[PDB]
From a paper:
We determined the cryo-EM structure of the full-length MCBulli complex, only lacking the first 100 residues of Mon1 that were removed to increase complex stability. The final consensus map had a resolution of 3.2 Å and allowed us to build a high-confidence model of the complex. The structure of the Mon1–Ccz1 TLD dimer subcomplex of Drosophila melanogaster (Dm) strongly resembles the structure of the MC1 complex from the fungus Chaetomium thermophilum (Ct), with high structural similarity of the LD1/LD1 core domains that bind the substrate GTPase Rab7 or Ypt7, respectively (rmsd of 1.96 Å over 183 residues). Bulli adopts a leg-like structure composed of an N-terminal β-propeller “foot” and a C-terminal α-solenoid “shin”. Binding to Mon1–Ccz1 is mediated by the α-shin domain, mainly via interactions with LD2 and LD3 of Ccz1 and a few contacts with LD3 of Mon1. The β-foot reaches away from Mon1–Ccz1 and shows some flexibility, describing an approximately 5° bending motion according to variability analysis of 3D intermediate reconstructions. The extensive interface between Bulli and Mon1-Ccz1 (2,021 Å2) is dominated by polar interactions, including a conserved salt bridge between BulliD539–Ccz1R449 and hydrogen bonds between BulliD539–Ccz1N447 and BulliQ535–Ccz1N385. Interestingly, the surface of Bulli contains an extensive conserved surface patch, running alongside the α-shin that points away from Mon1–Ccz1. From these observations, we hypothesize that MCBulli attaches to the anionic membrane surface via two basic regions at opposing ends of the complex, thus orienting the complex on the organelle. Consequently, no influence of Bulli on the activities of the Mon1–Ccz1 core subcomplex is to be expected, pointing at a role of Bulli as an adaptor that expands the interaction spectrum of the complex.
Tri-longin domain (TLD) RabGEFs represent a group of protein complexes that play crucial roles in the organization of endosomes, lysosomes, and lysosome-related organelles. The sole TLD RabGEF in yeast is the dimeric Mon–Ccz1 (MC1) complex, which activates Rab7, an essential organizer of the late endosomal and lysosomal compartments in eukaryotic cells. The Mon1–Ccz1 TLD subunits in metazoans bind an additional protein named RMC1 in humans and Bulli in flies. The intact trimeric complex is required for proper Rab7 function in endosomal maturation, autophagy, and lysosomal cholesterol transport.
Author numbering:
A (entry chain B): 6 to 100, 108 to 248, 271 to 275, 292 to 361, 378 to 395, 403 to 416, 426 to 484
B (entry chain C): 104 to 244, 250 to 528
C (entry chain A): 5 to 314, 323 to 426, 441 to 633
The structure:
């Protein structure tokens, strides 16, 4: 019998509140399994705070990262001064009850724990900004608790399976979309909507689940928009919808509120951003936009589909500046080794696993290249040319200078 | 003593604490344990709280410091490091300290002394032996840390006939003596000859304990010595009595005769006198002294000079616990780069021997080094080369080096240990 | 002042006024004004079209013979030809500027003679009732001889100069026939088509002219269904030289008419109203039965009144105005010769539709400047969000004639269009609107317009696109454009892109990729040395250059400035090993100038 990694608890706390005796239960802002008795809820926070206090003797309290134990593994994160997010896991077991906790990589789960906070901030803002109208400093926390419950009773349910995690989860990568010269320019021509309608501040396009035109937005904001649209529109021909949805992104100087509008034309999704200081738009804008955009988007999405329909070693190439990857994706140990090797001058690593697997890694110009050869026993001399053939077929230009 | 406001105390690169389950200080590497009393209370509180949930603390990871915990037999051990070492190596270090504690005091005596009465002060019994703990934990960062990382000792280079003559003298002069279980000859922290009794084998940990004891004491040259010593792996519930003495003034070789009977001082003294007379007559002290007077080996130095792109390497056969390593040279004379060399070796050793993800061959091309780590069914090899070398030359250099070692094996390595 | 777009030239050509002692004759092949003076022994005055100071040739010999009805000169001012009787045409030698005539050449014709033309430099063709004859004249024997002839009944003839084509009638029926006359060559051409029931036609209706390099016949007709007038156009652009009807011109007025050509435009004059109308063949229109029907491009208007300083203004649209097929006006009483010109600046206001104005201006001699001005006005001052499709079509109207010319000039084996606009001309206009929010939408539209017709981008356009994209922070478009190779790959573009590496690292990434594609390793090496990656630069230079060509002083100096001993050891051992491989020793050659590094190494690493 074998058991894989399973989630146990996820909680958020701040230790400043609850100083007065008899009200120590105010520090708990969110505990995931709600059926747990409050006494059991207090002790976890107590143990965590004890760990931060113990670490604070030598180094700073902000540097506490993880806690390892025979049966669990606890991970910490501090987004803002005072507030802490903690995630608790269960180690794999093989049956004498042997535990295999050494197979857990903390970086993947820390990245997941960061994605959680980023997804919260995208729609609601910082923890310290909620309820800014109330002057009473005690009633402000109730609104924060309500917002946390509403968001995290639906976010955690739709979480990805912990047993399956790879480099792509660590690195926030989206696949590349090959396309030709004319259709890309036709798609880019739709950014001229600003001149006709001066309210629009930005527009982005998606083809199915891949990016076609990103525009001005930063990669992290684009990833957030992609994740929301994938998990709330596609999986669940006109506008999808009275004040529209409000989101928080940064375009010029700082993060500001905006109204997000979503339009679907077959397999093309268009996201439009409007200002949030003024009044919500009326029906005339919707009617005009629909009557102006109905035929052209459908024609383009019908042409791209026709173009796409007409047209053992494994490889994975990743770009760090744009966060996009090209691959054709192996036992668990190989993937764990690739996770260990992932991360700056140039380098070159060749590694042979005990089960006859060759892994070749190179880095050059903010990019990473992985080639995996399997079921082949070859000496160290031949693997270089075997990798060079693959680096030649898939890369049009050679940047390694032979 | 506000230890939270002392930058010098917090800035050290290794801390080791040994305490009891009730919060009583026993051992601290830096600073008096009296003024560090709140910290031990905090440690005990953490350990007990986590243990009450039917689970045990293993480690703690922070931004720039790691902590490792251990608990056996009413004792708590904590190790804190700022270096590149992983948790398992710190656990091995803690096991070494525990083995030292059991070497000074028998396991049964400690178990009885805690079972009969708790809240006992163990400093009183562990008194006058701080040298054996300070010396053992000072092998950090001019190189015995390789011995600890690879868990293997170094052998004294000599022609095979001289070694056979020494072994023959020891066997012939020490045959009638009963209950004589080991006989060890050590010179300049290097093994020369070891004769054992059948059905008994020396374990690396005990052999390293003997080396540590011989290195720590300085009164062993003054006169003939008689002391008790406990070998944990051999027997955790008794003492073996040692007859310890140097060979002579001209040759600084230390001979240890370990026995189980208490009343054997004079017989072993006569055996020592006969042995040293026999070696003096057969021209064996001369070779030892000539080798000691030299600063470094000749043949190995010439072989390394013959390869102008090799800076350092480590070799260890799998069958036996022994090591071969050359002398440090100019590019790694300073400490600031010795630390980086140690970090490289630690990372390679961890990567090769990982249980979940075992590896078999590593080749890396970095900015300052070209590193190779090979693990086969007979040997292991860890080599460092210049950064602007080509790949097709490393292979031939490695091949010629291994071919030379395969023919000079008998001068640097001992295959089978002699028996009485 | 009003608005007028058809004008007379400021400087007329003045000659002797008409009277009871003088007459006027005109030859349009050389534009010669002929006047007589009976005060003397029949003196003459001959004037020229473009001579600033034309000494009039006064020959005063013709005294007997009767009345004159034809005067002509040879194309090189060598032989003079006159006609003095209904059945005789005579020739006079003209050496220098004086006649020297003793016996003059004469000739006889069976029927009454209509006219004669100078077909080439030394012979004359005569048209008489019987038909057409050709005669060659030389003065060395004072005799003329025939070469070829043909016999067809003739009522009246029409002549042209450029194409050497004559248009002739028949006495059998109301039919028109073309003919070609050249060097001993006479060729007949198929007749003009009017209708199976033969229909008559008069002299005032038929004209022959040149339009866009093709000879055309214009005939005025009135419809049966409606009393309005039209002009039928027959063009000689058929197999060989054969007539096909192609165009019909509409006027919707009644009265007298006159047709002229002004800068490849067909102009119709009217008297009762006081207006002149313009039509262009090339512009489109209603198309039925492979025939295009045309309407005036602007409402009717008049000619700018002209004043003279004998200011006393002169009358217009008089009775003695005589209009020739090209732009010539001759007046009887005044005695003046005028040319007609066009003003385009007023037309740039009446034609409000911009696409039609562009099509009208792309086929004119001086339409480049005005077209550039209107494009500048659209892009700079009067920009609106709904003007972009207009700009798209305007750009498509230029890039087609750009691509056709480039492709036709590309062909090789071993007349450019009237207005051609290239990238260098448009970039100068785009410069004045730099650093504004609406600049990217124009540049990308132009790039797409170039893309459709397979024209590659050049340097300065790529520079401007890069600058705008960087300023507006659009990196994905830049990556995709450099991936598709829509920007010229050159050292100037790569260096310009690298000069903007301080804003962000993606610009540096793109610059290094472009430098790698065009294989410029020196700049990459210098960049890595500036950053501090000396050993990577050395590794690259080992492959780019040889092993015996890598310099030693520069890399050692960089390692010394790095203030790290291990890198110094690495470079020193590299060069020591190179010396050992080459010269079989570990000693630096004296000519290498490395005396300081040896001492520094010995002071840092002691033996």
């Amino acid at each position: 019998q074998r058991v894989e990694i399973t989630l146990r608890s996820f909680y958020i706390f701040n230790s400043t509140f609850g100083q007065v005796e008899g009200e120590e239960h105010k520090k708990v802002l969110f505990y995931h399994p709600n059926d747990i008795e409050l006494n059991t809820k207090i002790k976890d926070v107590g143990l965590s705070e004890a760990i931060i206090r113990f670490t604070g003797t030598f180094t700073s309290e902000d540097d506490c990262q993880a806690l390892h134990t025979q049966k669990t593994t606890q991970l910490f994160y501090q987004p803002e001064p005072g507030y802490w997010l903690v995630l608790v896991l269960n180690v794999p077991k093989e049956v004498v009850a042997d535990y295999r906790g050494a197979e857990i990589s903390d970086r993947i789960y820390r990245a997941i724990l960061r994605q959680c906070y980023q997804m919260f901030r995208f729609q609601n803002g910082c923890f310290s900004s909620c309820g800014s109208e109330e002057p009473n400093p005690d009633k402000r926390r109730e609104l924060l608790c309500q917002k946390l419950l509403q968001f995290y009773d639906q976010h955690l349910t739709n979480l990805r399976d912990p047993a399956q995690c790879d480099i792509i989860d660590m690195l926030h990568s989206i696949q590349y979309l090959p396309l030709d010269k004319t259709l890309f320019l036709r798609a880019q021509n739709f950014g001229t909507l600003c001149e006709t309608f001066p309210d629009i501040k930005e527009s982005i396009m998606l083809y199915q689940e891949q990016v076609l035109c990103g525009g001005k937005l930063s990669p992290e904001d684009l990833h957030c928009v992609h994740s929301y649209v994938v998990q709330h529109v596609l999986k669940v021909g006109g506008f999808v919808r009275d004040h529209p949805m409000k989101v928080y992104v940064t375009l010029d100087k700082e993060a500001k509120p905006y109204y997000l509008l979503i339009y679907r034309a077959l397999h093309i999704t268009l996201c439009l951003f409007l200002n949030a200081d003024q009044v919500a738009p009326k029906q005339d804008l919707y009617d005009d936009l629909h009557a102006y955009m109905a035929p052209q988007l459908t024609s383009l999405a019908r042409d791209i589909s026709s173009e796409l329909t007409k047209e053992a070693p494994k490889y994975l190439f990743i770009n760090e500046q744009s966060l996009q990857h090209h691959t054709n994706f192996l036992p668990r140990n190989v993937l764990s080794i690739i996770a260990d090797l992932a991360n700056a001058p140039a380098e070159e690593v060749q590694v042979k696993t005990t089960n006859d697997y060759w892994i070749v890694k190179r880095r050059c110009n903010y990019r990473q290249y992985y080639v995996i050869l399997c079921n082949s026993k070859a000496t160290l001399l031949d693997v270089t040319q075997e990798a060079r053939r693959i680096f030649e077929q898939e890369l049009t230009d050679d940047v390694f200078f032979d | 003593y506000d230890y939270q406001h002392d930058s010098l105390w917090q800035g050290q690169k290794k801390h080791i604490f040994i305490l009891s389950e009730a919060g009583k200080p026993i051992f601290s590497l830096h600073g008096n344990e009296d003024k560090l009393a709140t910290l031990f209370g905090v440690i005990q509180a953490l350990v007990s709280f986590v243990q009450m949930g039917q689970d045990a603390i293993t480690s703690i990871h922070a931004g720039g410091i790691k902590f490792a915990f251990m608990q056996r037999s009413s004792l708590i051990l904590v190790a804190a490091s700022r270096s590149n070492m992983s948790v398992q190596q710190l656990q091995l270090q803690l096991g070494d300290v525990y083995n030292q504690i059991l070497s000074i005091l028998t396991y049964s005596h400690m178990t009885k002394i805690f079972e009969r009465r708790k809240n006992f002060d163990l400093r009183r019994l562990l008194s006058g032996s701080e040298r054996l703990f300070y010396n053992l934990l000072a092998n950090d960062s001019s190189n015995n840390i390789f011995t600890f990382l690879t868990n293997s000792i170094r052998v004294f280079p000599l022609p095979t006939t001289i070694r056979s003559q020494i072994t023959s003298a020891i066997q012939s002069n020490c045959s009638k003596i009963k209950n004589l279980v080991f006989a060890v000859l050590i010179a300049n922290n290097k093994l020369i000859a070891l004769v054992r009794m059948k059905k008994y084998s020396i374990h690396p940990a005990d052999l390293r304990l003997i080396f540590n004891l011989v290195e720590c004491s300085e009164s062993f040259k003054s006169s003939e010595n008689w002391s008790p010593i406990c070998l944990p792996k051999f027997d955790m519930n008794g003492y073996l009595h040692a007859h310890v003495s140097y060979l002579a003034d001209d040759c600084q070789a230390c001979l240890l005769l370990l026995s189980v009977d208490r009343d054997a001082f004079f017989t072993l003294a006569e055996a020592k006198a006969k042995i040293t007379e026999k070696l003096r007559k057969s021209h064996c002290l001369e070779a030892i002294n000539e080798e000691l007077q030299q600063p470094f080996n000749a043949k190995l130095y010439q072989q390394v000079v013959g390869i102008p792109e090799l800076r350092h390497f480590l070799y260890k056969p799998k069958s036996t616990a022994q090591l071969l390593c050359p002398m440090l040279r100019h590019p790694y004379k300073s400490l600031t780069e010795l630390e980086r060399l140690e970090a490289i070796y630690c990372d390679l050793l961890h990567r090769i021997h990982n249980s979940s993800r075992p590896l078999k061959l590593i080749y890396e091309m970095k900015e300052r080094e070209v590193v190779l780590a090979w693990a086969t069914g007979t040997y292991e090899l860890y080599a460092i080369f210049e950064p602007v070398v080509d790949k097709a030359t490393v292979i031939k250099y490695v091949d010629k080096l291994i071919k030379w070692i395969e023919k000079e094996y008998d001068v640097y390595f001992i295959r089978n240990h002699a028996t009485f | 002042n009003g608005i007028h777009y058809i004008e007379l030239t400021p400087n007329p050509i003045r000659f002797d006024a008409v009277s009871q002692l003088t007459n006027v004759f005109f030859d349009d092949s050389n534009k010669q004004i002929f006047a007589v003076r009976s005060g003397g022994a029949t003196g003459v005055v001959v004037k020229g079209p473009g001579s600033p100071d034309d000494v009039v040739i006064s020959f005063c010999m013709s005294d007997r013979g009767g009345a004159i009805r034809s005067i002509k000169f040879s194309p090189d001012n060598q032989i003079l030809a006159v006609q003095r009787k209904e059945n005789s045409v005579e020739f006079i030698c003209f050496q220098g500027d004086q006649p020297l005539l003793q016996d003059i050449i004469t000739h006889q014709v069976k029927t009454l003679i209509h006219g004669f033309v100078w077909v080439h430099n030394r012979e004359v063709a005569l048209i008489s009732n019987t038909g057409v004859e050709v005669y060659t004249v030389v003065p060395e024997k004072r005799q003329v001889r025939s070469v070829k002839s043909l016999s067809i009944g003739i009522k009246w003839f029409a002549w042209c100069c450029d194409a050497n084509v004559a248009l002739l009638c028949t006495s059998e029926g109301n039919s028109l026939i073309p003919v070609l006359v050249k060097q001993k060559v006479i060729t007949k051409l198929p007749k003009v088509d009017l209708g199976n029931p033969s229909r008559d036609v008069q002299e005032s209706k038929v004209t022959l002219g040149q339009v866009y390099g093709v000879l055309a016949v214009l005939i005025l007709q009135s419809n049966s269904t409606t009393g309005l007038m039209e002009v039928e156009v027959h063009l000689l652009n058929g197999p060989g030289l054969a007539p096909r009807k192609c165009h019909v011109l509409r006027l919707s007025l009644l009265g007298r008419f006159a047709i002229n050509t002004v800068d490849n435009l067909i102009v119709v004059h009217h008297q009762a109203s006081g207006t002149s109308l313009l039509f262009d063949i090339s512009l489109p229109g209603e198309v039925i039965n492979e025939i295009t029907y045309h309407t005036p491009i602007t409402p009717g208007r008049s000619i700018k009144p002209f004043g003279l300083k004998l200011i006393l203004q002169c009358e217009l649209y008089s009775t003695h105005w005589v209009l020739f097929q090209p732009n010539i006006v001759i007046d009887a009483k005044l005695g003046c010769m005028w040319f007609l010109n066009l003003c385009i600046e007023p037309l740039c206001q009446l034609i409000s539709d911009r696409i039609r104005l562009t099509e009208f201006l792309l086929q004119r001699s001086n339409g480049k400047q005005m077209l550039l001005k209107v494009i500048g006005q659209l892009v700079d001052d009067q920009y609106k969000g709904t003007l972009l499709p207009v700009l798209e079509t305007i750009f498509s109207r230029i890039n087609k004639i750009y691509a056709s010319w480039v492709q036709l000039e590309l062909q090789n084996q071993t007349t450019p269009p009237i207005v051609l606009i290239e990238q260098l001309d448009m970039v100068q206009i785009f410069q004045r609107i730099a650093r504004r929010p609406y600049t990217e939408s124009i540049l990308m539209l132009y790039l797409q317009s170039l893309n459709k017709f397979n024209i590659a981008a050049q340097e300065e356009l790529s520079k401007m696109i890069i600058s705008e994209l960087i300023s507006n922070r659009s990196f994905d478009t830049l990556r995709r454009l450099v991936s598709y190779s829509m920007l010229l790959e050159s050292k100037s573009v790569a260096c310009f892109l690298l000069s903007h590496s301080n804003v962000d690292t993606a610009i540096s990434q793109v610059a290094i990729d472009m430098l790698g594609r065009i294989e410029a390793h020196e700049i990459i090496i210098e960049v890595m040395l500036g950053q501090g990656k000396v050993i990577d630069a050395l590794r690259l230079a080992k492959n780019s250059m040889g092993l015996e060509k890598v310099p030693a002083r520069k890399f050692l100096e960089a390692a010394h400035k790095t203030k790290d001993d291990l890198i110094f050891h690495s470079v020193y051992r590299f060069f020591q090993m190179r010396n050992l491989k080459l010269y079989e020793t570990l000693s630096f050659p004296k000519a290498e100038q490395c005396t300081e590094f040896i001492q520094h190494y010995n002071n840092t690493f002691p033996a």
